[PDB]
Amino acid sequence: RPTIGQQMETGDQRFGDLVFRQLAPNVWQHTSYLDMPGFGAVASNGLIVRDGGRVLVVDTAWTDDQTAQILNWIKQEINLPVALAVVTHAHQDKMGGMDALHAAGIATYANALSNQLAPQEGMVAAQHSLTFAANGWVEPATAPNFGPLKVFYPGPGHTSDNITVGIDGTDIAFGGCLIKDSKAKSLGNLGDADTEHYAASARAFGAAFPKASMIVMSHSAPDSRAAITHTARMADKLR
Amino acid sequence: RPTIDQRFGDLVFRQLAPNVWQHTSYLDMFGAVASNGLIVRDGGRVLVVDTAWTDDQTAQILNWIKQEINLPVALAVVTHAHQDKMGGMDALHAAGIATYANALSNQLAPQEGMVAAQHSLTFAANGWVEPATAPNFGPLKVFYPGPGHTSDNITVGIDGTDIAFGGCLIKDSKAKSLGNLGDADTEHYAASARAFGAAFPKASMIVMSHSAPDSRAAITHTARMADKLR
Ligand SMILES: CO/N=C(\C(=O)N[C@H](C(=O)O)[C@@H]1N=C(C(=O)O)[C@@H](COC(N)=O)CS1)c1ccco1
Ligand SMILES: CO/N=C(\C(=O)N[C@H](C(=O)O)[C@@H]1N=C(C(=O)O)[C@@H](COC(N)=O)CS1)c1ccco1
Ligand SMILES: [Zn+2]
Ligand SMILES: [Zn+2]
Numbered sequence A: 001r002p003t004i005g006q007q008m009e010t011g012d013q014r015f016g017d018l019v020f021r022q023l024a025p026n027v028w029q030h031t032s033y034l035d036m037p038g039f040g041a042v043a044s045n046g047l048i049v050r051d052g053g054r055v056l057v058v059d060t061a062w063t064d065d066q067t068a069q070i071l072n073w074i075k076q077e078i079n080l081p082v083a084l085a086v087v088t089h090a091h092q093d094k095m096g097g098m099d100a101l102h103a104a105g106i107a108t109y110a111n112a113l114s115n116q117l118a119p120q121e122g123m124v125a126a127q128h129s130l131t132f133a134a135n136g137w138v139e140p141a142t143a144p145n146f147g148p149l150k151v152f153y154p155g156p157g158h159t160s161d162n163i164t165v166g167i168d169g170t171d172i173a174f175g176g177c178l179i180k181d182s183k184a185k186s187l188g189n190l191g192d193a194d195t196e197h198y199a200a201s202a203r204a205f206g207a208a209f210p211k212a213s214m215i216v217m218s219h220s221a222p223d224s225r226a227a228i229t230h231t232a233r234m235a236d237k238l239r
Numbered sequence B: 001r002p003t004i005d006q007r008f009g010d011l012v013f014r015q016l017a018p019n020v021w022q023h024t025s026y027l028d029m030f031g032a033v034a035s036n037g038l039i040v041r042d043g044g045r046v047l048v049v050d051t052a053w054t055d056d057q058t059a060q061i062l063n064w065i066k067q068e069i070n071l072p073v074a075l076a077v078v079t080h081a082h083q084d085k086m087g088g089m090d091a092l093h094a095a096g097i098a099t100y101a102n103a104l105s106n107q108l109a110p111q112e113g114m115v116a117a118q119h120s121l122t123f124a125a126n127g128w129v130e131p132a133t134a135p136n137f138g139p140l141k142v143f144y145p146g147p148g149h150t151s152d153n154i155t156v157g158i159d160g161t162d163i164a165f166g167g168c169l170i171k172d173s174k175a176k177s178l179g180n181l182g183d184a185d186t187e188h189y190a191a192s193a194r195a196f197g198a199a200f201p202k203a204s205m206i207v208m209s210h211s212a213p214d215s216r217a218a219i220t221h222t223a224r225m226a227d228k229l230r
C-alpha cells in the first residue's frame, strides 16, 4: 500500500518486494517501491516485453536489489534471456538499478543526454546512447534490434532528457514520468522540469503514438489517452 | 507547485467563510508536499487548527494572522502527532499560544519527533471531547472518530459554518489511495471515517490535510477505500 502510486488490485502478482501486472499477452508492468522515512512508499513502474525468444525491459527499479528481483521474476515466469533494457531518464526511479542489469550481462540504452546527466546524479550511465531526429524519432542505427520498442523523444518536459516508448504490435505506449494520470492533481516533481515546453512535449508524445489506447506511466496505473490530454492541460498552466 | 489563493511568504491562504481561512504550507523533500490547516476568528480572538510543517512556517502563519486579522491568537488544536500537524509547536509556544492535542498525540509526540502540546484533550467513548479539557473553544467542536490514519487522529467541526476538518483521516473524493498508511489502523479506519461523517452531519465543506476542500463525497469515498483494507 504505497503512499504514492497505484495500489494492488485483481490482476497483480506480488513477487518479493515488487508487483507485476500483465497488460497484454507479451507485456507486463513491473512496479517497485522506495520507502521514504516518515512518508511511506513511492511506486515506480516500468515494462517487460516478450519478443519471440527474448525479453526487453523498459526502466530499472529504484535500486539494484529490486532490479535483480525483476530479473528473477523474468527467469521464473518467462524463462527467456533479457536482450536489452532502455531507461527513460536520469533519475533514480528509472536508472537506480543499472548495476544489476550490467552484472547480469544485459545491454543498456538511454538517451545520450541521460548518459551525460547520470553521473551528475550519482548514477551509472547506460552502456549505449540513443540519439534523436529533430522530430523526436530515435535514430535507428542507435537502436539496433529493438524489436517492438519504438523510442520517441517528445521534447523537454518532466526533464530535458525524458524519452518515451511505444510497443509496436500492441495498443500500448509508455510515457514514463512525463505523463501523469487523468485524475492527477499535479505534474509530480517539477524540480528538473521544463515548464515552458512541457505541454508541447506531452502533446508530441500523444501525436507520436496516435493509436495507443493504453498509456502506461511511472507513478500511476495504466490509463486512457485522457492521461495525455490531462497532463497537457495541467502543463498549459505552467506557461 | 508542490509534488503532492493568497501567497504570503512561503505559504498560501484561502478564505473559506467570513471567519475561516485555510492555511497551506510545503515541505520540500522528490519535491514539495502541501499540508492544510485552519484559522478561525471567534469573539475577538483567533483559533488555529494544526501547525505548518516547521517552526519557521508556523511563525509565518502567525505573521499573516497579524497582518490580515490583527487579533490575539488564543489557542491552537493540533490533530495528530505527525510533522505536517505538529512540526511548528515551538513557534506557537514562543508566541504565548495555548496548545491542545489528544492526550495520545502528546504521548506519541516525542517518539514521532514532535514537541507535545501543553494541554491534553480526552474523549468520551462516543468520541466527543470531554468539555472540561477544552475550555474556551468557541465554535470548535472536537471529535475523536477512532483509529484511522493514526491511532490518535482527531477532527474538528466549526459550529455556525458549513465546515468540518478531517485532517489526514479524510482523503478527497477523487483520491487513488489513503496516503501514508504506515501508522494506520486498517481494521478500524472505515468505521472511523464514517464516525467523522456522522459526528458532523451538517457539514457540506470537508477540509482535509492534503487536498483542496471537497464535498461530503470525500467522506464516502474515504470510507469505501478503507472498507477494502479489511
Ligand atoms: C535522482 O532521482 N532521485 C529520486 C527520484 O528519482 N525522484 C523522482 C523525481 O523526483 O523526479 C520520482 N519521480 C517523480 C515524478 O514526478 O516522476 C516524483 C514522484 O513522486 C510523486 N509522488 O510524484 C518524485 S519521486 C528520488 C529521491 C527520493 C525520491 O526520489
Ligand atoms: C512524523 O511525521 N513525518 C512526516 C509526516 O508528517 N508525514 C505525514 C504522514 O506520513 O502521515 C504526511 N501525511 C500524509 C498523509 O497521508 O496524511 C502523507 C501525505 O503524503 C502524501 N502525498 O500522501 C505522507 S506526508 C514526514 C516526514 C517526512 C516527510 O513527512
Ligand atoms: Zn524523474
Ligand atoms: Zn518519476
Ligand SMILES: [Zn+2]
Binding pocket: B080, B082, B149, B150, B168
Ligand atoms: Zn499523519
Ligand SMILES: [Zn+2]
Binding pocket: B035, B082, B084, B168, B209, B210
Ligand atoms: Zn498528513
